[PDB]
C-alpha cells in the first residue's frame, strides 16, 4: 500500500517553470546571457533537472554531402556519354552521335505521326503527331527483344552549344510542367520552346540510288541547363573546353561523403575552464560569485568519463545528442581471409541464343 499522506500539497503550484533571459548581449564570436531565477517560499529545488533551451538556424556549408555513391543515372556505364553533336573542320561541319529509342508509324512533312484520332462523322481520325514539348520521351522503346525494326523512329539530342557531359551523374531541372527538360527562352515572353526538328536517312541512299532520298529518322534538337553537383571528371582527354570528337570519352567519379554535425554532448557549446568568460551564479542579495574555476579543470573529459562510469554507453539518447564516436574494427585491422572463387558466373544473351544460322 502507498504512503497515506503528507507527501503532496493541495494549494495550487506549477510542476514546471520557464524563465526569460533578462540580459542578452552578443559579440564577434560569442554571446552572453543572464537570468534571475527565483526559488519560492516553501518550494525546494534540485539543480540536476535544469538545462537550457536553444533554437536557431544553421547551414552546413555547400560541402555537406551525407550519401556515398551518387543519385543521377547511377546504373549507366561510366563511359558512354549522352547523345550530342559538335563542330569539326574538313570550313566547318557537324558530327552527330545519337540513339533513337522509339519506333513510330510513318514520317510526315513536319513531324512523326504517333497515332490517329477516332474516326467520326466526316472526322476520320486526323493524323496525330508528336509534341515537341515532350512527345518524344527518354525511356520508351520496343517492349520485347524480338524487335521488328520498324521503318520509322525517333529520339532526341540537344545542340552543340551546351557543353558535353557524361551520362553518369548528370541532372537537369525540369522546366515544362509535365516533365520535359528544356530551356525556355524569352520571345515577348517565355512562350518560346525553341526545338528544331531534323530529318535523317541512310547514308548510301542519301548519296545516290534509284530513288529520291528517303528519311527514316526524326530528331528533336533542343537545349537545357546542365550540372553534375555530385560528380567530378576522373580523366580529361584535353585541357580545353569546347567539346570536340575526343571529348566523347570523358568520364567522372562521385565526390566523397561529408558528415558534418554537432559534436557529442554539445561539447564546446558552453565556455568552461577559461578565465575569460567565467560564468556566474550567486544570490541576488549581493554580487558574490559562487562559481570559481581555474584554467586546468578539464571538466569536459572528466564529465565524459563519469557519464561512462555509471552505466552502459552503446545506446544513444536523443534528449541531448548522446552518442559516442564509433568505428568498425575491420577498417583499422583487416582479416583478409580471401574469397570464395568457386564455380564461376556468367552473362548470357537476352534471348538465350547467341546467333542461330538459318538451315
Amino acid at each position: 500500500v502507498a504512503p497515506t499522506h503528507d507527501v503532496t500539497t493541495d494549494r495550487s503550484q506549477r510542476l514546471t517553470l520557464r524563465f526569460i533571459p533578462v540580459d542578452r548581449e552578443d559579440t564577434a564570436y560569442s554571446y552572453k546571457a543572464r537570468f534571475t531565477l527565483a526559488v519560492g517560499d516553501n518550494r525546494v529545488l534540485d539543480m540536476a533537472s535544469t538545462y537550457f533551451d536553444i533554437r536557431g538556424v544553421l547551414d552546413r556549408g555547400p560541402t555537406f554531402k551525407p550519401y556515398s555513391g551518387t543519385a543521377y543515372n547511377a546504373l549507366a556505364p561510366k563511359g558512354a556519354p549522352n547523345s550530342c553533336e559538335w563542330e569539326q573542320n574538313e570550313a566547318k561541319k557537324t558530327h552527330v552521335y545519337a540513339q533513337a529509342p522509339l519506333s513510330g508509324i510513318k514520317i510526315t512533312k513536319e513531324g512523326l505521326q504517333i497515332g490517329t484520332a477516332d474516326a467520326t462523322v466526316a472526322g476520320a481520325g486526323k493524323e496525330i503527331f508528336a509534341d515537341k514539348t515532350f512527345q518524344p520521351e527518354p525511356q520508351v522503346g520496343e517492349s520485347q527483344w524480338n524487335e521488328a525494326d520498324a521503318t520509322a523512329a525517333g529520339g532526341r539530342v540537344l545542340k552543340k552549344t551546351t557543353p558535353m557531359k557524361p551520362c553518369y551523374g548528370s541532372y537537369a531541372r525540369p522546366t515544362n510542367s509535365n516533365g520535359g527538360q528544356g530551356v525556355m527562352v524569352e520571345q515577348n515572353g517565355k512562350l518560346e520552346s525553341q526545338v528544331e526538328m531534323q530529318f535523317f536517312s541512310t547514308s548510301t541512299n542519301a548519296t545516290n540510288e534509284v530513288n529520291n532520298i528517303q528519311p527514316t529518322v526524326v530528331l528533336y534538337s533542343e537545349d537545357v541547363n546542365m550540372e553534375t553537383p555530385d560528380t567530378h571528371l576522373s580523366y580529361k582527354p584535353k585541357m580545353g573546353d569546347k567539346n570536340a570528337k575526343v571529348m566523347l570519352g570523358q568520364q567522372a567519379m562521385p565526390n566523397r561523403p561529408n558528415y558534418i554535425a554537432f559534436r557529442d554532448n554539445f561539447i564546446g557549446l558552453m565556455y568552461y575552464n577559461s578565465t575569460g568568460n567565467m560564468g556566474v551564479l550567486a544570490g541576488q542579495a549581493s554580487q558574490l560569485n559562487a562559481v570559481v574555476d581555474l584554467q586546468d579543470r578539464n571538466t569536459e573529459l572528466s564529465y565524459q568519463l563519469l557519464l561512462d562510469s555509471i552505466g552502459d554507453r552503446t545506446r544513444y539518447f536523443s534528449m541531448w545528442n548522446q552518442a559516442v564516436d564509433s568505428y568498425d574494427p575491420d577498417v583499422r585491422i583487416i582479416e583478409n581471409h580471401g574469397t570464395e572463387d568457386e564455380l564461376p558466373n556468367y552473362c548470357f544473351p537476352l534471348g538465350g541464343i547467341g546467333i542461330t544460322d538459318t538451315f
Binding site: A290, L294, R332
Partner: protein
Amino acid sequence: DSITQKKFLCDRTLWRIPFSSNFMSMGALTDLGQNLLYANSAHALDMTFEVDPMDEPTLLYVLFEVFDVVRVHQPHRGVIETVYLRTPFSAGNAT
C-alpha cells in the same frame, strides 16, 4: 625465406602509474600519500620520456591524479557559500 615482425595497438585509453608501494588499488587514498616522508618537506621532481619518432610537431599530455573537492553551505535565506580546494598547488589568496 623471410623475417618476422610483431606489433600491437591499444587505443581509447590512457596508461596509469599509481603512487602506491605495490601498484595496487587498495583505496581511494594511497598509503604512501599518508607516509610522513613524502608529506613533511619539499622535494624536486624529474622525469625522462623516450618515444618513437614522428614528423609533425606533437604534444605530451600529463595528468596528476589528485583530490579536488568543494564544500558548500547556506547560512540563511538566499545565500550560497562555497569553498573549493585542490590538493597540492594553489588557489585564490592566503593574505
